[PDB]
Amino acid sequence: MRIGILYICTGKYDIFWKDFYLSAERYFMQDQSFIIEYYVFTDSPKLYDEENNKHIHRIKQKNLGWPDNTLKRFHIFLRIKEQLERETDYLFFFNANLLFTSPIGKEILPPSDSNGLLGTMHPGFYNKPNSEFTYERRDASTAYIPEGEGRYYYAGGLSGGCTKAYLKLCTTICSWVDRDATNHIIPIWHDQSLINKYFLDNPPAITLSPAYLYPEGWLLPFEPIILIRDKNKPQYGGHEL
Ligand SMILES: CC(=O)N[C@H]1[C@@H](OP(=O)(O)OP(=O)(O)OC[C@H]2O[C@@H](n3ccc(=O)[nH]c3=O)[C@H](O)[C@@H]2O)O[C@H](CO)[C@H](O)[C@@H]1O
């Protein structure tokens, strides 16, 4: 089947796209059943390595800067809503600085009988209890959730599921941020604080171990599968804006 993979890279984050694109081929979508379709949102005219592979689709999108670039990601997925219904069956989002290390496959695709959602544990909060989750604790916010509840702390570096179930997600949170905008609030950990609520209302069919979000340099009780490139390396410099 045809699986769609969402990817955002604006400003200088187009430096991350390449090693990701190559790694995606080596490891993602290996066995013939599956065909990969890149949906890239960039300011830039040119994306590596284009021309050559049809599937990859460059989608024009300007720079909104921090924090709007991760806050309004879901409005970015809806500019092309109708397109995602005819050309895709499953959806996924990968962080710009992600990288593949070990093969992937059908193990991450939600069963069709379930809700059809996917989340991933956060690498820093997988060994911690509810007391330490960094949700949003302001009542007037749509991302408000108090103490003693919430099962996990999901990260926004990876999320997906069936196209239907994921678009409804995209459409849901789009209102939630917009509603906050009229209430004059910006959530603390905007991509996540919003998402964690949604995964609280409707917990994903799958929760992926932080092996799929492996920070570089770290020592975890896991085998690397998908990796997080370290931004404070002198090649990247923390700062892109
Ligand atoms: C996994 C995690 O807990 N990390 C945080 C953050 O990672 P970091 O704060 O470590 O990285 P970041 O916020 O610079 O990256 C945000 C991601 O959004 C996209 N992008 C692209 C171009 C651009 O100009 N700005 C931009 O934000 C891009 O794919 C990038 O990977 O981002 C995650 C992805 O949502 C979450 O939101 C969290 O806030």
Side-chain angles (χ1 to χ4, degrees):
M1 25 200 161
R2 57 200 197 287
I3 49 193
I5 163 225
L6 290 337
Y7 186 78
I8 307 179
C9 55
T10 72
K12 195 43 172 51
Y13 286 93
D14 64 86
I15 186 73
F16 290 167
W17 163 257
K18 182 190 183 69
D19 287 316
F20 166 91
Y21 168 74
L22 307 185
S23 64
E25 315 286 310
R26 215 209 148 186
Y27 299 61
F28 227 45
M29 289 350 144
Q30 247 3 47
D31 67 308
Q32 16 159 26
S33 359
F34 300 104
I35 15 130
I36 313 130
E37 299 283 355
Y38 306 105
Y39 298 21
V40 181
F41 307 87
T42 249
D43 46 34
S44 113
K46 183 68 180 295
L47 233 158
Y48 176 77
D49 60 9
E50 208 329 50
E51 45 242 346
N52 325 318
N53 155 317
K54 136 61 191 341
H55 273 276
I56 128 170
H57 308 130
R58 185 182 75 252
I59 301 186
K60 301 194 198 297
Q61 166 86 45
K62 214 44 187 291
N63 193 335
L64 290 69
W66 228 293
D68 285 348
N69 259 43
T70 179
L71 184 46
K72 297 185 278 168
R73 62 181 57 177
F74 298 106
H75 299 92
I76 292 159
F77 304 149
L78 264 54
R79 290 182 48 198
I80 58 171
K81 165 188 176 36
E82 271 75 11
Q83 182 169 352
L84 276 61
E85 302 191 17
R86 64 183 190 83
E87 300 190 341
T88 53
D89 290 312
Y90 293 109
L91 270 195
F92 289 103
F93 173 69
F94 293 75
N95 224 311
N97 57 336
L98 276 174
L99 194 55
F100 296 79
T101 301
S102 101
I104 298 301
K106 311 170 285 292
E107 56 262 22
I108 71 169
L109 294 196
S112 45
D113 46 314
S114 64
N115 45 22
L117 283 70
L118 174 139
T120 63
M121 239 108 61
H122 198 288
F125 295 73
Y126 81 106
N127 57 328
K128 307 180 171 176
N130 192 317
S131 78
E132 279 273 352
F133 286 162
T134 60
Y135 296 141
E136 172 73 310
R137 303 299 186 191
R138 296 168 170 93
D139 330 25
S141 171
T142 43
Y144 171 75
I145 292 290
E147 293 82 329
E149 60 198 18
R151 184 187 167 184
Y152 296 118
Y153 191 73
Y154 297 87
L158 212 118
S159 63
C162 296
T163 298
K164 185 170 180 296
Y166 195 80
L167 264 52
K168 196 55 222 167
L169 159 54
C170 283
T171 305
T172 289
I173 299 189
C174 273
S175 101
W176 289 3
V177 40
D178 285 24
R179 170 180 310 158
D180 287 12
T182 190
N183 298 267
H184 289 307
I185 309 196
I186 283 207
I188 53 90
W189 284 115
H190 4 269
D191 186 16
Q192 313 184 3
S193 304
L194 268 297
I195 273 191
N196 300 349
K197 181 155 308 202
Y198 191 60
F199 286 154
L200 184 155
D201 296 13
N202 37 223
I206 308 185
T207 302
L208 289 188
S209 117
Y212 297 103
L213 272 80
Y214 195 46
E216 178 178 12
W218 282 33
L219 286 161
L220 283 182
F222 300 95
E223 207 182 355
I225 295 180
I226 299 189
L227 189 141
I228 296 190
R229 290 185 286 268
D230 206 353
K231 285 171 188 166
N232 301 85
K233 290 191 259 199
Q235 33 226 142
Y236 309 152
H239 255 323
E240 287 102 330
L241 33 73

